[PDB]
Amino acid sequence: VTGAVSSVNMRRFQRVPKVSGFSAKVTKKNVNKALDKADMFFAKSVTMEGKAAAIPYGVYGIQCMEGSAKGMAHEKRAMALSAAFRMNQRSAAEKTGAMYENRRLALILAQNDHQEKQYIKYPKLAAAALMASTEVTRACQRYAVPESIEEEFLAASVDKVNKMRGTTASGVYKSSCVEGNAKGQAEQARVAALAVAFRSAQKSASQFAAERYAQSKYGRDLFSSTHFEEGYANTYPAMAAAKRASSYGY
Amino acid sequence: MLDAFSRVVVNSDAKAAYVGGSDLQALKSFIADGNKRLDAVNSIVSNASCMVSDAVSGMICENPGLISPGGNCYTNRRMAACLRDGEIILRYVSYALLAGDASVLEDRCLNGLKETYIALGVPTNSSIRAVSIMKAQAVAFITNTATERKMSFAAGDCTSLASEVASYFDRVGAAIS
Amino acid sequence: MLDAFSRVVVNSDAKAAYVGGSDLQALKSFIADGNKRLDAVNSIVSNASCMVSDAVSGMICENPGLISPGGNCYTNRRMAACLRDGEIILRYVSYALLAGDASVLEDRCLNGLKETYIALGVPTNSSIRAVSIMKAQAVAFITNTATERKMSFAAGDCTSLASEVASYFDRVGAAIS
Amino acid sequence: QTGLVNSKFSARMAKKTAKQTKNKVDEYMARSVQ
Amino acid sequence: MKSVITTVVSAADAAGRFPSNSDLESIQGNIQRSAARLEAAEKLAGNHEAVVKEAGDACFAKYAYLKNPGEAGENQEKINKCYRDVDHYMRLVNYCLVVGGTGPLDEWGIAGAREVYRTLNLPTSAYVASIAYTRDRLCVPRDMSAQAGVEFSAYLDYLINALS
Amino acid sequence: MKSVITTVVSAADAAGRFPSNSDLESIQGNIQRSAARLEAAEKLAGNHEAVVKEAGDACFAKYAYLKNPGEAGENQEKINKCYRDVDHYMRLVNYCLVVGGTGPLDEWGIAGAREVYRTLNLPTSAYVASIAYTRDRLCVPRDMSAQAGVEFSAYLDYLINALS
Amino acid sequence: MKSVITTVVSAADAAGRFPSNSDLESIQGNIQRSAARLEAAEKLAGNHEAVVKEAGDACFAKYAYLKNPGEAGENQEKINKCYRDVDHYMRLVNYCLVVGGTGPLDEWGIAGAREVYRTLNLPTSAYVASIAYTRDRLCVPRDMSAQAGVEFSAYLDYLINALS
Amino acid sequence: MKSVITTVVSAADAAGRFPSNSDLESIQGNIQRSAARLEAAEKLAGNHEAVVKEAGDACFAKYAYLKNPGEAGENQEKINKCYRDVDHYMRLVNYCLVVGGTGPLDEWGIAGAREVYRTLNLPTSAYVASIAYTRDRLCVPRDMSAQAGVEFSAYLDYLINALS
Ligand SMILES: *C(=C)C1=C(C)[C@@H](Cc2[nH]c(/C=C3N=C(/C=C4\NC(=O)[C@H](C)[C@H]4CC)C(C)=C\3CCC(=O)O)c(CCC(=O)O)c2C)NC1=O
Ligand SMILES: *CCC1=C(C)C(=O)N[C@H]1Cc1[nH]c(/C=C2\N=C(C[C@H]3NC(=O)C(CC)=C3C)C(C)=C2CCC(=O)O)c(CCC(=O)O)c1C
Ligand SMILES: *[C@@H](C)C1=C(C)C(=O)N[C@H]1Cc1[nH]c(/C=C2\N=C(C[C@H]3NC(=O)C(CC)=C3C)C(C)=C2CCC(=O)O)c(CCC(=O)O)c1C
Ligand SMILES: *[C@@H](C)[C@H]1/C(=C/C2=NC(=C\c3[nH]c(C[C@H]4NC(=O)C(C=C)=C4C)c(C)c3CCC(=O)O)/C(CCC(=O)O)=C2C)NC(=O)[C@@H]1C
Numbered sequence A: 001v002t003g004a005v006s007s008v009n010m011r012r013f014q015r016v017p018k019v020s021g022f023s024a025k026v027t028k029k030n031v032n033k034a035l036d037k038a039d040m041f042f043a044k045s046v047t048m049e050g051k052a053a054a055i056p057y058g059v060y061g062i063q064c065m066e067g068s069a070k071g072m073a074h075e076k077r078a079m080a081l082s083a084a085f086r087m088n089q090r091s092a093a094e095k096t097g098a099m100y101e102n103r104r105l106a107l108i109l110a111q112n113d114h115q116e117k118q119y120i121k122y123p124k125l126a127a128a129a130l131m132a133s134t135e136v137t138r139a140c141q142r143y144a145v146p147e148s149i150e151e152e153f154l155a156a157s158v159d160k161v162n163k164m165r166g167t168t169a170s171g172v173y174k175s176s177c178v179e180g181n182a183k184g185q186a187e188q189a190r191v192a193a194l195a196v197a198f199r200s201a202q203k204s205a206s207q208f209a210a211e212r213y214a215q216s217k218y219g220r221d222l223f224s225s226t227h228f229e230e231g232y233a234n235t236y237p238a239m240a241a242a243k244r245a246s247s248y249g250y
Numbered sequence B, C: 001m002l003d004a005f006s007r008v009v010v011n012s013d014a015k016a017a018y019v020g021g022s023d024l025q026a027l028k029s030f031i032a033d034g035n036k037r038l039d040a041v042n043s044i045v046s047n048a049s050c051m052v053s054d055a056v057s058g059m060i061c062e063n064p065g066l067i068s069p070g071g072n073c074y075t076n077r078r079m080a081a082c083l084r085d086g087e088i089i090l091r092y093v094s095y096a097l098l099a100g101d102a103s104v105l106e107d108r109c110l111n112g113l114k115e116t117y118i119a120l121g122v123p124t125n126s127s128i129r130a131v132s133i134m135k136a137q138a139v140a141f142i143t144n145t146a147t148e149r150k151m152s153f154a155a156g157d158c159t160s161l162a163s164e165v166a167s168y169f170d171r172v173g174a175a176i177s
Numbered sequence D: 001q002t003g004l005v006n007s008k009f010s011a012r013m014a015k016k017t018a019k020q021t022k023n024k025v026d027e028y029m030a031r032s033v034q
Numbered sequence E, F, G, H: 001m002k003s004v005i006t007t008v009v010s011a012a013d014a015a016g017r018f019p020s021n022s023d024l025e026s027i028q029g030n031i032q033r034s035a036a037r038l039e040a041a042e043k044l045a046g047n048h049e050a051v052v053k054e055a056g057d058a059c060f061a062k063y064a065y066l067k068n069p070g071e072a073g074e075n076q077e078k079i080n081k082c083y084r085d086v087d088h089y090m091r092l093v094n095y096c097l098v099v100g101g102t103g104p105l106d107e108w109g110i111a112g113a114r115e116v117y118r119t120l121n122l123p124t125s126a127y128v129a130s131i132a133y134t135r136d137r138l139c140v141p142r143d144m145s146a147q148a149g150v151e152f153s154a155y156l157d158y159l160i161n162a163l164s
């Protein structure tokens, strides 16, 4: 056995951070590499806390089904984990524009002044704080059943604009709105989403009453600035429930 | 959802009655043959995927109009969904066989099936025939009376639980028709 | 998430072999003290509402500079948060004692907890002092040697479980220090 | 999913809306007085 | 209504699956603890009167200031209500053994009761002085069997854990 | 993976609860079966070199077209990878005989299964020719105890009903 | 049904635009290249009674195991059933010939195709046994013209490559 | 830039499908149609300094209030910054010929152009009046061929309908 001394690169995880010079360059890029991992624990802390209201007393609920046939549950996160690759594949202005859009919407539902600071500094938390609020207070499109044939037109009228930002300035398709990546996945997304739809209209009689007032409150708090804008939200809740947050493509 | 134990208390909380040993003799008579319940839940999942293949071919052989353009079970998409929902109602009635009583079948499967099976145009006479296949097949497994298969169970009296699951497909046929 | 039973199969499948004789010896014995293991965690979850104040007032009365102005437990919102992380840690440790493996402990509770507390500014020394009281409380609750609560128990040994729960708390202390 | 207008195939809302229950309580009350 | 049944069949539903072996396995163990938690019911359902009789003065021997004017127990029907309210708690636990889970308490006594007691200005410490007496007024070999008394204490301290 | 306790400890993690008497009675079921169900798990371990030569040759003798060129079983050494997939899988049934539930079979033998067979022209009906014959070679008086046989058949036809 | 012109009047409907210069330039290709694929429509619809006949007997020449009991083709009532299924497949490719795109296949012969055959035990190898033979069976002057053979085959293997 | 082929590959990517015969037919109509619309591009590129001179002062003839003190074209540097914008829009309609669609106009010349002209007090009627003078002065058998003229004019009015 020859006496192999430890490498000089292996020794460079044993030094002290000094300020003046190249030492600050490596000190910066390992701090924010770990500040990113703080947000991923910040975002996950509120993600399963809001999810903890969905399962109310330990028994699971019909809202949080992930599949209904044999292969239905397993194919879901193949779409999800590849969509996460498509989210961070965006450009600069698609990303910084979505940073400042959530900072305009998270700022107008924060109850605390600490909670305001938690959304400004950590952008992956301000994102999932919006998304978790719509899951528990069911103000998504995927939970809104329109109560009339005009509302099904009125909800269809607004998401034609919401789908219109899933395409670029010239009309070619963005990477955001996309329903498949492999042979047969896009058809499997269709047979998935109807079981969400049959169970969205399968709530109790006491929970349709709750999100009726909530989606009306959801539209007139974050998107409405005038009196007519809070008239379509008071009168047709599902039309206000389909108002997305403009950082998506769909 | 409720089980065979959340049935006795809801019929006492409506009268504010203490659950004493007057009606606890039937809960002592529930666990008495309580082995044979899950010794019957094994008798569905053991060959579950071939069950609806016996059903939908029995639906096609009895009513052969579904293969025509205009029959519901026509296309590869529309045969799939009938193959998809022939399983799903079998899954939920296995829960009602398991849980002791059918308060989960009437709350997560029948909650709006009768209206989406008239607003879509699904033939309710073949639908009650699809159920009528899978009611007579359960009593060929829970009584070990399959023609192409025997199953090793401890032999005894179990047919009171055979009429139990026969009381349950007569709750899903009594839902959509 | 893994447990003690599912820890065996991964190491059995690290080298792609069966389970023979030499592996289930720590599994046929693991179900022997499993009846003690239910008696173990029934003691910890019966008192965790009483334990978390018994361990967060101790970290105040030792270092009283936390409730000073500008301290990390100063306002009434800071205190309500710190009373909740001490209920989360005592919730996830109680999972790992029932699982018999710390695989649940640093995927759902501890992975990234350190640099979260780095960015928040939660003091790392006053947090181990918070944790270790709950270690010294659980070992005095498992072996029934609390000062103020003697419970009814089957007579026999229990120090092996107190040895196991003492190996989970210092994983929390090591992960953030 | 999207609205019924575009990008979706089959029908929805197998749920008795608030007008739809008003017709049935009318009809039961009418068969009784009949 | 949480139990060993409705937990393994509701979680299995979200994955879209049949009863597995493990879902079958737990309800075998439901019959193993069956003979104890059934047995504690008819003793509680048989002598519920004297148990809630000793549960209410334990509110009062610790706090006799409730009989003051301006307080929670000033007239008779504010105390005649009170013996019934802990009776409802001592009847909820009889429902809580028979299902064998955290079923009846989490729906009918724990959900939102933090605002029922606060806004009506009831002392929430007066409730936990009552049920933390019957938890240790109970003998192990005399009251019931030694094993069923392990379950009976196991629910009262959960209720003690909840209101406090 | 999906054990008897990993579900019931995550069904209380999701609600943020502490494990109570529904979550604890579930593990009493992991004793009164696991005494019986572990009688067969190591019986599979010793004779595991003979079960693959029990079913894997009765497959090729019955579905005998597979030895022509233009098939998957055309050459000699590709047959060995088709023999390896029997003790890849009933290896996993031994692994799921010990962990109580079906978890290590689902993540390692069912998740991501059908996409590979449908691409690489591996007919899954010739898979179940071996396995449902292995399902019907279990001679439960001679082979093992009674109840560990129906804990061996039940994990076996879980694989027929999911390859199908 | 996806075609050459509904893939551009839907892409302009998505952006909320009027019909631009680009989408008209597409439909010019649905004049020139459209003439060949509708010329080939009369080749297939005129002799469809025998391309189901020269393909169905090739199924029972390569895979000769299906006539046995317990198989997919156990009797006569299912053999002609199998012969019937070949007739549907190029019927839709005649529909795809006149529509211009892959319209009546992705909705009718691809949508949920694999989920059906896996239940009733139908090999995708036996469905592509019919189609892959008749793909490179035709000679370019006799069956149709030269460039129509480029149209017919490139629509033929699409049903092969997606079912496999 | 939206063009003939970027939209059909982006609609095939957004469903995950391979390039079909639909997308391969849609470029057949790009081959014959390029042989017309190319011949306006080099024709305009060779003679752009005479088009924008005529099309420039045909704005200061229709509106001569622009040279009043306070308005857009008051001094000579502001007049030169008007002729340059005509030369910009002549480039982006030269680019739309060679790209094959409306792409380079509504990326660099239409998007946001409503808000710059409103803020900087530029009248958009003066922009469509300098474009429409070029659209009507177009001798269809002299300046180009027939089908090069139906394509060169089809972008000059898409720009007009954009700016109003
Ligand atoms: C402040 C300076 C200060 C405290 C606050 C208090 C905290 C403390 N407690 C221990 C040891 C235990 N604490 C326990 C918690 C409880 N005891 C009970 O009996 C009830 C159930 C619960 C209160 C609701 C327990 C069980 C112990 C173990 C022994 C026992 O039987 O009580 C310590 C560490 C030990 C030490 O340092 O002496 C601390 C700091 N003590 C304070 O000094
Ligand atoms: C109500 C929502 C919820 C909570 C809370 C939770 O813990 N899980 C979901 C529902 C749920 N799902 C299962 C079982 C599975 N869930 C999935 C989906 C996962 N796969 C993914 O790619 C992602 C994105 C990160 C997720 C969440 C899958 C594949 C399964 C297993 C399917 C199988 O074949 O077993 C359960 C528990 C039941 C179980 O079997 O674990 C719950 C509550
Ligand atoms: C993203 C939101 C989209 C915009 C914007 C748009 O214009 N079109 C969307 C993307 C897109 N999707 C397809 C093709 C399919 N999409 C499918 C999913 C839908 N079908 C459903 O049943 C459900 C749930 C109810 C959904 C979302 C399916 C299926 C297809 C067909 C896949 C195939 O292989 O044929 C396309 C291509 C154009 C088209 O409509 O086919 C685009 C651009
Ligand atoms: C499939 C192999 C299953 C299986 C299923 C069982 N099916 C049973 C009875 C049954 N079978 C049919 C359809 C059959 N009869 C027909 O005339 C035609 C074709 C036109 C077919 C496919 C029906 C309608 C019924 C219901 C009762 C009846 O009418 O006979 C059955 C019970 C009897 C037995 O087989 O012993 C079983 C077990 N068997 C299996 O093992 C896999 C899972």
Ligand SMILES: *[C@@H](C)[C@H]1/C(=C/C2=NC(=C\c3[nH]c(C[C@H]4NC(=O)C(C=C)=C4C)c(C)c3CCC(=O)O)/C(CCC(=O)O)=C2C)NC(=O)[C@@H]1C
Binding pocket: C032, C033, C035, C036, C038, C039, C040, C042, C142, C143, C144, C153, C154, C155, C156, C157, C158, C159, C161, E033, E147, E150, F024, F025, F028
């Ligand atoms: C050390 C932590 C303790 C101690 C532990 C022991 N417990 C013993 C036995 C025991 N515990 C239970 C209850 C447990 N089993 C269940 O099924 C349920 C509820 C679902 C629970 C909480 C039972 C049933 C038993 C068996 C005896 C009985 O019939 O009650 C025990 C005996 C040996 C053993 O089981 O391995 C010990 C040593 N005992 C102590 O002295 C300290 C305080």
Ligand SMILES: *[C@@H](C)[C@H]1/C(=C/C2=NC(=C\c3[nH]c(C[C@H]4NC(=O)C(C=C)=C4C)c(C)c3CCC(=O)O)/C(CCC(=O)O)=C2C)NC(=O)[C@@H]1C
Binding pocket: E059, E066, E072, E073, E077, E078, E079, E081, E082, E083, E085, E088, E089, E108, E109, E120, E122, E123, E126, E127
């Ligand atoms: C007396 C020493 C008690 C006490 C009792 C009071 N309770 C009062 C109101 C009240 N309490 C409950 C909860 C109880 N009733 C139930 O039905 C159930 C379980 C399902 C429980 C736990 C309710 C729902 C109500 C309102 C309706 C009612 O009057 O029963 C009350 C009156 C307060 C007021 O009216 O403002 C009294 C005096 N109060 C005490 O301090 C101790 C604990």
Ligand SMILES: *[C@@H](C)[C@H]1/C(=C/C2=NC(=C\c3[nH]c(C[C@H]4NC(=O)C(C=C)=C4C)c(C)c3CCC(=O)O)/C(CCC(=O)O)=C2C)NC(=O)[C@@H]1C
Binding pocket: G024, G025, G026, G028, H033, H146, H147, H150
């Ligand atoms: C009646 C509605 C009209 C009229 C119609 C005719 N148009 C004729 C020919 C023609 N137009 C275009 C340009 C247009 N066709 C395209 O394919 C595209 C882009 C994809 C565009 C913008 C073309 C290319 C042609 C064909 C002749 C050529 O090579 O340029 C036409 C000629 C006869 C025919 O259709 O074959 C007629 C009658 N003409 C009229 O006078 C009235 C007003």
Ligand SMILES: *[C@@H](C)[C@H]1/C(=C/C2=NC(=C\c3[nH]c(C[C@H]4NC(=O)C(C=C)=C4C)c(C)c3CCC(=O)O)/C(CCC(=O)O)=C2C)NC(=O)[C@@H]1C
Binding pocket: B057, B060, B067, B074, B075, B076, B079, G059, G066, G072, G073, G078, G079, G081, G082, G083, G085, G086, G088, G089, G108, G109, G116, G120, G121, G122, G123, G124, G126, G127
């Ligand atoms: C032999 C060439 C085949 C084969 C064919 C069989 N198919 C059987 C039943 C069957 N096939 C289909 C799909 C069919 N419907 C469609 O709409 C289309 C195209 C769009 C097709 C191909 C369905 C829906 C059914 C069930 C109803 C029916 O009988 O038609 C079948 C009988 C199976 C049985 O006994 O139940 C056979 C033999 N089988 C083979 O092995 C190769 C692949």
Ligand SMILES: *[C@H](C)[C@H]1/C(=C/C2=NC(=C\c3[nH]c(C[C@H]4NC(=O)C(C=C)=C4C)c(C)c3CCC(=O)O)/C(CCC(=O)O)=C2C)NC(=O)[C@@H]1C
Binding pocket: A005, A006, A007, A008, A009, A010, A011
């Ligand atoms: C062998 C069992 C491994 C393997 C080893 C390779 N390591 C290579 C470079 C390298 N190795 C180490 C490890 C060692 N040196 C230290 O100073 C310390 C402690 C601080 C340790 C553990 C280091 C740090 C490095 C990088 C530094 C350097 O050598 O320049 C290496 C060369 C790869 C190449 O030629 O580019 C190999 C092959 N690789 C293997 O696959 C097996 C598993």
Ligand SMILES: *[C@H](C)[C@H]1/C(=C/C2=NC(=C\c3[nH]c(C[C@H]4NC(=O)C(C=C)=C4C)c(C)c3CCC(=O)O)/C(CCC(=O)O)=C2C)NC(=O)[C@@H]1C
Binding pocket: A047, A048, A049, A050, A051, A052, A053, A054, A055, A063, A064, A065, A066, A076, A077, A079, A080, A131, A132, A133, A134, A135, A136, A139, A140, A141, A142, A244
């Ligand atoms: C609503 C505010 C959003 C929206 C979100 C989407 N959710 C999608 C899938 C999905 N998300 C959840 C989590 C949900 N369950 C909970 O228990 C809680 C709170 C603790 C929440 C938010 C579930 C159960 C599911 C279904 C299973 C799955 O993940 O597939 C989803 C589709 C992504 C996908 O297919 O994977 C979206 C887009 N939907 C909206 O349109 C608004 C913006």
Ligand SMILES: *[C@H](C)[C@H]1/C(=C/C2=NC(=C\c3[nH]c(C[C@H]4NC(=O)C(C=C)=C4C)c(C)c3CCC(=O)O)/C(CCC(=O)O)=C2C)NC(=O)[C@@H]1C
Binding pocket: A068, A194, A195, A198, A199, B072, B073, B077, B078, B079, B081, B082, B083, B084, B085, B086, B088, B089, B109, B113, B116, B120, B122, B123, B126, B127, B130, D010
């Ligand atoms: C098959 C034996 C039937 C039959 C079934 C069809 N169902 C179709 C659509 C459909 N099916 C269900 C039932 C099921 N899916 C669920 O998710 C749930 C509960 C959660 C249940 C009970 C639903 C809800 C739907 C609508 C959603 C969907 O599109 O799948 C269908 C095709 C409709 C279409 O695509 O146009 C068919 C053919 N039809 C029959 O003839 C027999 C009796």
Ligand SMILES: *[C@H](C)[C@H]1/C(=C/C2=NC(=C\c3[nH]c(C[C@H]4NC(=O)C(C=C)=C4C)c(C)c3CCC(=O)O)/C(CCC(=O)O)=C2C)NC(=O)[C@@H]1C
Binding pocket: H059, H066, H072, H073, H078, H079, H081, H082, H083, H085, H086, H088, H089, H108, H109, H116, H120, H122, H123, H126, H127, H130
């Ligand atoms: C001439 C027909 C108009 C007129 C135009 C003026 N435009 C002035 C500035 C200006 N113009 C544009 C759009 C143009 N510039 C670009 O870079 C591109 C795309 C590549 C386009 C289409 C912009 C963005 C700007 C502002 C920045 C700049 O100065 O270049 C302008 C000067 C404004 C001023 O100095 O006050 C004039 C005068 N004026 C006319 O007389 C008619 C109305």
Ligand SMILES: C=CC1=C(C)[C@@H](Cc2[nH]c(/C=C3N=C(/C=C4\NC(=O)[C@H](C)[C@H]4CC)C(C)=C\3CCC(=O)O)c(CCC(=O)O)c2C)NC1=O
Binding pocket: B032, B033, B035, B036, B038, B039, B040, B042, B141, B142, B143, B144, B153, B154, B155, B156, B157, B158, B159, E021, E024, E025, E028, F033, F146, F147, F150
């Ligand atoms: C998790 C998996 C799991 C199971 C499947 C059951 C398995 C099981 N079944 C029975 C036992 C039995 N099972 C049946 C059931 C039947 N006999 C018949 O003739 C019919 C075919 C069928 C339904 C009527 C009968 C009649 C008995 C004996 C009655 C009794 O045990 O009291 C017993 C008690 C006797 C024994 O030790 O085997 C057990 C443990 N328990 C489990 O833990």
Ligand SMILES: C=CC1=C(C)[C@@H](Cc2[nH]c(/C=C3N=C(/C=C4\NC(=O)[C@H](C)[C@H]4CC)C(C)=C\3CCC(=O)O)c(CCC(=O)O)c2C)NC1=O
Binding pocket: G043, G044, G045, G046, G047, G048, G050, G051, G054, G136, G137, G138, G139, G140, G142, G143, G144
């Ligand atoms: C849509 C397109 C389309 C077709 C191509 C034909 C397909 C076709 N060709 C032949 C029949 C034939 N086809 C050929 C041609 C050839 N034989 C070969 O082996 C060579 C590879 C190739 C030379 C070019 C010959 C020589 C026959 C007659 C011999 C025979 O196949 O029995 C037959 C059987 C006889 C019959 O027509 O009934 C059929 C169905 N029909 C159609 O509808």
